[PDB]
């Protein structure tokens, strides 16, 4: 089967089973059937938030107004306080999730609509709630299911780019996009740092600490600068 490394020899416990299994386990965390099932949800969860997140920042910049994203201040301003939202954020996501988390651990018991009964679906796959969540079904096959991971697993991997780039380069995702294509051999953060024997240069973080928001510290330091190239 296709693998992450075309000449590789996939680990024993992982063969051709889960959606999109290319045989990648340096550490072999999937050998445990119980925990791998847990991890199986996380990959979707981390993926499905990042995808919707990475598409957020990009749209947040190019079509939208341009402030690379550290912003509390917006042009949707701050309509209802903050502690107003965070109040409603907790109770919202609390119900939303400890609900879905229970369909992971003890499957099917949640399918009923709490108020009245339209239910949902049969028990299906713990991390793929059918029915009301997936009405449209653009592709008709689990080919589309393998098609979902390979997008997300890139986006999660892509998101980390936005952090680090916006650390030292101090610019949004698509700003440095165009900045690279102009004089490409510059701005690789390969050029921009060396650390050979003797000499060590590192670019300094272009975002500062102590960002002022409504009279609050918010230290927000850089991510482990000392070990940067």
């Amino acid at each position: 089967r296709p693998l992450w490394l075309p000449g590789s020899t996939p680990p024993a416990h992982l063969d051709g089973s889960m959606t999109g299994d290319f045989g990648w386990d340096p550490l072999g965390l999937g050998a445990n059937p119980e925990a791998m099932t847990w991890f199986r949800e996380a990959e979707l969860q981390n993926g499905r938030w990042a995808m919707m997140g990475v598409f957020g920042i990009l749209v947040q910049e190019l079509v939208k107004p341009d402030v690379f994203w550290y912003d509390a201040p917006t042009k949707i301003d701050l309509p209802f306080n903050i502690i107003g939202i965070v109040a409603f954020q907790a109770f919202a996501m609390h119900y939303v999730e400890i609900r879905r988390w229970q369909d992971l651990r003890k499957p099917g018991s949640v399918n009923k609509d709490p108020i009245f009964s339209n239910y949902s679906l049969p028990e299906h796959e713990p991390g793929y709630p059918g029915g009301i969540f997936a009405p449209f079904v653009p592709g008709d096959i689990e080919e589309l299911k393998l098609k979902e991971l390979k997008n997300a697993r890139l986006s999660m991997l892509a998101f980390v780019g936005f952090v680090m780039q916006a650390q030292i380069t101090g610019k949004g995702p698509i700003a440095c996009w165009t900045d690279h294509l102009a004089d490409p051999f510059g701005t690789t953060i390969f050029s921009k740092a060396v650390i050979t024997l003797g000499g060590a240069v590192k670019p300094t973080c272009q975002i500062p600490d102590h960002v002022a928001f409504q009279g609050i510290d918010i230290p927000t330091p850089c991510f482990f600068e000392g070990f940067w190239p």
Binding site: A12, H13, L27, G28, L29, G30, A31, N32, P33, E34, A35, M36, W38, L197, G198, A200, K202, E225, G226, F227
Partner: protein, 212 residues
Amino acid sequence: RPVWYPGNSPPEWLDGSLPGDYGYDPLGLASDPEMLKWWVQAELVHGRWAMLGTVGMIVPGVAARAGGDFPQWYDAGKVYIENSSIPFGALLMTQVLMMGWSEMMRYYEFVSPGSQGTGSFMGFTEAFAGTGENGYPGGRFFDPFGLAKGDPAKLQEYKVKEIKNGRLAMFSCLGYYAQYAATGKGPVDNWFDHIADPFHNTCATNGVSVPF
């Protein structure tokens, strides 16, 4: 088996299966079968405190190259209680309280492996029950990633790595002490000092190790 000091044979009592067993007991302190399992835990514990100690020394040192104002591992004790805000007694006596709990708990699972997770410590059965080996608790808390649950052939292969990385962390952490008492400077400072002018920064030039 690849023993240390090749050409000899291991001490006849330990040829057995222990992770990282090279047949080194030149003073024969494993000769007591009851006592060996006590040393096997003793090493495992030191190996685990070593590997945390080494990183705890190097990183604040390596952090100091870029600035970021930390102390060296020595005289990091002062700098904290220099700035204090809580007394020394309260801190050291919270140590003995919380820390002594774990150790004196870690002990009675070694004595009798059945208890400690029978129950009736806030529930938590099977998290503390232990996986049956000397220095390996396993479980929910001590093993959050559920590793050492799946393939055992891969597990026994970690248990070897853990020791061999531990024996090196100890033997390095003996260097941090000794090369502090001589050169009086941080571990990464020395790792730069010898990488800069290797010739005049060597051991014979510290003026302590090689007295005249």
